[PDB]
């Protein structure tokens, strides 16, 4: 019963914006609040400004203390990575590079790793140092992770403070924060619950056939549902006219909204209540079975 | 006749689809998805919207944020009324094309119409009386709803991706109800007990 | 602009009747309107009424008496106009 079908594809380069949702890897949820210019971010002594300012007060309540240690370890991870970038920037020779990598891999306790750059190559070591410019990766199997001593030794191998807390500077004031602030390199995600797939409004659109209400869903211009408990919430309050208009004029009565929409344009703001057609349809279904029902009098 | 009047009461003579108990005139009234609780108490309404929550510290507690797109789509009948009086257009089709073109001469009009026009806000699990409030909106660029922090205690709403719906009252009776009772400043003690609700969290 | 309603609640010895009296006053102001009694601040007629109630010159007892006075004057004017039209041909 169909002749031919045609299909098209659409590509959207959807970028980041307020109202999205990002999270780490420990359940620390978050919704983007406001994107600030680069200068307003807190910046450390060497000019490099931070990119994410999280709220620490969600740490002791949700108890997910692992993310702080992840931040501390990740901060040390760039310490070797940045320093490697410093030597390679001034084209340091191979013997100074290779030995240094031999010092990074042999730290800690008697780990199962045993790497010897003395026996790979020269070009291969150069390529490996090339691939470590953005940060030396660190692996950690689940229930045997590095303790405080190992991460402290890794931090000290660079040129960073042992405690992992540095002093910042506010961009708005230029005044040093009186207490040290924890910074580091966190792995952060991006979730599909995007804001532009949720935001939708409706002035007036289509209408269902069996009973006169606006449809639902972001598709076909649906209208949000005045919930059953919202009726009770307004009922506890004193707004009677609001509820009357909400479930008589804007939703159901065909003579109501049609006459209301004519008045709303001419400066008039007066309702004309009628009879909800959903109740009328129900009346027929009550009269249909075997039982008489009707409105009594005027 | 038994199956028509009350299907599934005695013999379940359905044979509608592959193992599908079909409805009846009795089933279409009763139940969770019947007629009463589906389309007579909680009834879908016009002039509504839904979006994601976002905190804002720079705005006072009796006013809330609102994106340009949702406001322009919600207040379309209001835009037509004010534009016709000023004589920018003559027919409703011209005004609709003007809105569809989002020219620069409609943002100022929308700013004029929203100066003292409160809007409603509620969470999806409306549980108690304070689950619905009203605020005088302030137009802000973005795609979410900016909201004052303190009143977030009333909603028991965190910021992990919760969503809110907006409804707009129209008549003078409804707007006066909004300003007189629905506002955030008018509800600072809980109905349950005398403790405040604007407690710092 | 107005932030609270507490002054109007103090004036009229109930909160629910305030909505009705202010709605009647503001509807009279908007459609078939006359001049307001307070110098406006280019605000809508929704908030103009609440400013008048807290100013202590408009309430239900003042408004309905003013309505009776104006309708009596309008009926007297109608009678005078009818008599003048009848005497125009005479």
């Amino acid at each position: 019963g169909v002749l031919k079908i045609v299909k098209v594809y659409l590509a959207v380069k959807r970028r980041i914006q307020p109202g999205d949702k990002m999270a780490g890897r420990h359940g620390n949820k978050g919704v983007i609040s406001k994107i600030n210019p680069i200068e307003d971010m807190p910046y450390d002594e060497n000019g490099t400004p931070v990119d994410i300012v999280l709220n620490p007060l969600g740490v002791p309540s949700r108890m997910n203390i692992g993310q702080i240690l992840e931040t501390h370890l990740g901060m040390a991870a760039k310490g070797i990575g940045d320093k490697i970038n410093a030597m390679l920037k001034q084209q340091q020779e191979v013997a100074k590079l290779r030995e240094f990598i031999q010092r990074a891999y042999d730290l800690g306790a008697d780990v199962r790793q045993k790497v010897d750059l003395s026996t790979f190559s020269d070009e291969e070591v150069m390529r490996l140092a090339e691939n470590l410019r953005k940060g030396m990766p660190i692996a950690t199997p689940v229930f045997d992770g590095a303790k405080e001593a190992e991460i402290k030794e890794l931090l000290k191998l660079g040129d960073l403070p042992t405690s992992g807390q540095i002093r910042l500077y506010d961009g708005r004031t230029g005044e040093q924060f009186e207490r040290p602030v924890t910074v580091g390199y966190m792995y952060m995600l991006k979730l599909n619950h995007l804001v532009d797939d949720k935001m939708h409004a409706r002035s007036t659109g289509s209408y269902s056939l069996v009973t006169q209400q606006p449809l639902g869903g972001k598709a076909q211009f649906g209208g949000q549902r005045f919930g059953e408990m919202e009726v009770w919430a307004l009922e506890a309050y004193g707004a009677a006219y609001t509820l009357q208009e909400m479930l008589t004029v804007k939703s159901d009565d065909v003579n109501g909204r049609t006459k209301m929409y004519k008045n709303i344009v001419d400066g008039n703001h007066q309702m004309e209540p009628g009879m909800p057609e959903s109740f009328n349809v129900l009346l027929k279904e009550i009269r249909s079975l075997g039982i008489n029902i009707e409105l009594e009098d005027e | 006749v038994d199956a028509l009047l009350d299907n599934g009461r005695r013999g379940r003579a359905i044979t509608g689809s592959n193992k599908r108990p079909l409805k009846s005139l009795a089933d279409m009234i009763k139940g969770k998805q019947g007629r009463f609780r589906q389309n007579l108490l909680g009834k879908r309404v016009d002039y509504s919207g839904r979006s994601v929550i976002t905190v804002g510290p720079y705005l006072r507690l009796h006013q809330c944020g609102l994106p340009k797109k949702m406001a322009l789509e919600l207040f379309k009948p209001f835009i037509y009324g004010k534009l016709e009086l000023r004589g920018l257009a003559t027919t409703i089709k011209a005004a609709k094309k003007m809105v569809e073109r989002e020219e620069a001469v409609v943002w100022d009009i929308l700013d004029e119409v929203i100066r003292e026009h409160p809007v409603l806000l509620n969470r999806a699990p409306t549980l108690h009386r304070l689950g619905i409030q009203a605020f005088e909106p302030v137009l802000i660029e973005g795609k979410a709803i900016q909201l004052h922090p303190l009143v977030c205690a009333a909603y028991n709403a965190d910021f992990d991706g919760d969503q809110m719906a907006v409804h707009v009252p129209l008549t003078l009776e409804a707007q006066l109800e909004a300003r007189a009772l629905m506002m955030s400043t008018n509800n600072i003690l809980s109905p349950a007990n005398g403790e405040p609700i604007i407690v710092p969290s | 602009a107005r932030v609270t309603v507490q002054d109007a609640v103090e004036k009229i010895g109930n909160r629910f009747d305030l909505v009705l009296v202010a709605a009647r006053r503001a509807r009279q102001m908007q459609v078939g309107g006359k001049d307001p009694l307070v110098p406006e601040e280019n605000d809508k007629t929704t908030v103009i009424a609440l400013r008048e109630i807290e100013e202590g010159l408009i309430n239900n007892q003042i408004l309905d008496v003013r309505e009776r006075q104006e309708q009596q004057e309008q009926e007297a004017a109608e009678l005078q106009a009818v008599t003048a039209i009848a005497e125009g041909r005479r």
Binding site: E235, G238, A239, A240, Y241 | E173, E177 | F16, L20
Partner: peptide, 18 residues
């Protein structure tokens, strides 16, 4: 006949249906 409408509802009950 609970909130604002109670004042209107009382007026109809006392003036009419009597």
């Amino acid at each position: 006949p609970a909130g604002t409408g109670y004042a209107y509802h009382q007026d109809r009950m006392r003036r009419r249906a009597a």
